[PDB]
């Protein structure tokens, strides 16, 4: 059978994500790409304007640029991105998230948060 690299261990005990909330009218599914140095747990709010394509947010002491990637021609199509969620049938297994209509679940918006130009 399949064997993962010698130094890789299986992910057991996958945390909760509310699958049921997915095709709920008032809910949207987003993907954000953010710098690794930002501590999201310390944030209380993300001042993203869902109406803007480009903007400059201010998280903590720093300034960043924001791009609504789905508002570009490049990011018009994100059907290459599928969300895999846990299963209640096979222990420690993931399956592709599907709609009530057996349609593949797609991201509604995608944002890149990037640092402003600096010479370190």
């Amino acid at each position: 059978g399949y064997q993962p690299p010698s130094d890789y261990k299986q992910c057991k005990h996958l945390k909760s994500f509310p699958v049921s909330e997915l095709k709920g009218d008032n809910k949207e599914l987003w993907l954000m790409k953010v710098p690794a140095n930002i501590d999201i747990s310390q944030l209380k709010s993300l001042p993203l304007d869902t109406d803007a394509t480009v903007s400059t947010v201010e998280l903590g002491s720093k300034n960043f640029n924001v791009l609504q990637n789905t508002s570009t021609q490049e990011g018009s199509d994100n059907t290459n991105l599928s969300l895999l969620i846990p299963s209640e049938k096979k222990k420690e297994t993931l399956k592709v998230a599907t709609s009530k209509d057996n349609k593949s679940v797609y991201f509604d918006r995608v944002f890149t948060i990037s640092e402003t130009a600096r010479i370190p």
Binding site: E21, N26, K27
Partner: protein
Amino acid sequence: RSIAIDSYQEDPSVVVSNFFKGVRVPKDTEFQLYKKRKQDQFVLHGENERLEYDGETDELTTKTNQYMVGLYDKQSGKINLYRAPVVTSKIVSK
């Protein structure tokens, strides 16, 4: 005999500090532990009846960026964030 492993805790609990021989630390002394932000690397494997699915995270991306999956509520203006790996995958026939 054989030593049985009753429990194994992988997440932080205890700390072994190394000072000098004969160290005396007052019982009232309070300590805090801090962990270096080191983001995980993943491999994804999938199997169908006909196909095999295989993918990995990008080592450099893992160092530069973090990805969040968000469930946003248009009405309440509230978001639920979930850190997630982004794995680029290949499909291969059996």
